Design a protein around this ligand. Structure first.
Ligand SMILES: Cc1sc2ncnc(N(C)C)c2c1C
Ligand SMILES: [Cl-]
Ligand SMILES: [Cl-]
Length: 182
């Protein structure tokens, strides 16, 4: 009902339509990306600095680290929205890597509609310190996007890109896209 065809528009980039949204995957350094929102995969204290979270907090800077700890002490948060710091984005959304990945992605999509944002870039959420299985993570990320499109919620969001640190995890995402294609 929603899926287009898997192709490669650029070297190392694989894409398919899901309703109105262009879904893309690539391996690389997520801190080099430009998007309205970049997603960080962190701990329930919002102060993990290991793997992708290390790279994101180091590049974003100390003011973003300060924003995270200030919000963490104010209430119990499922996720936190900060400025982008010295990353090339308007906001960072910091999600908990051990949480249900479909729920986390659904929340990111809804927050991006609230701000009239068009582009999102995320890592393979939960595959680092949380040690969630790569094919379960791939299935959950793509399922969240399908549900968002099925409900007619996609209006401003046009592009969702997963930039993945390990090439072996990229290969798992590509196989999941091929399973779904029209
Ligand atoms: C050995 C690993 S796994 C991993 N996952 C995410 N980010 C990383 N960076 C860039 C620090 C790493 C490194 C260097
Ligand atoms: Cl993680
Ligand atoms: Cl990753």
């Amino acid at each position: 009902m929603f899926y287009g065809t898997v192709s490669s528009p650029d070297s190392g980039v694989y894409e398919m339509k899901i309703g109105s949204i262009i879904f893309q995957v690539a391996s690389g350094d997520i801190t080099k990306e430009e998007a309205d929102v970049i997603v960080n995969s962190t701990s329930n204290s919002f102060n993990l600095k290991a793997g992708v979270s290390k790279a994101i907090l180091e590049c974003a800077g100390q003011n973003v680290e300060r924003e995270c700890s200030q919000q963490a002490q104010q209430r119990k948060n499922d996720y936190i929205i900060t400025g982008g710091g010295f990353l090339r984005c308007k906001n960072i959304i910091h999600v908990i890597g051990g949480n249900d990945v479909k729920s986390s992605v659904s929340s990111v999509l809804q927050e991006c509609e609230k701000k009239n944002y068009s582009s999102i870039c995320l890592p393979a959420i939960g595959t680092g310190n949380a040690k969630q299985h790569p094919d379960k993570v791939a299935e959950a990320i793509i399922d969240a996007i399908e549900d968002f499109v099925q409900k007619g919620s996609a209006q401003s969001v046009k592009k969702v890109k997963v930039v993945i640190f390990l090439p072996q995890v990229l290969d798992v995402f590509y196989a999941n896209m091929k399973k779904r294609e029209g």
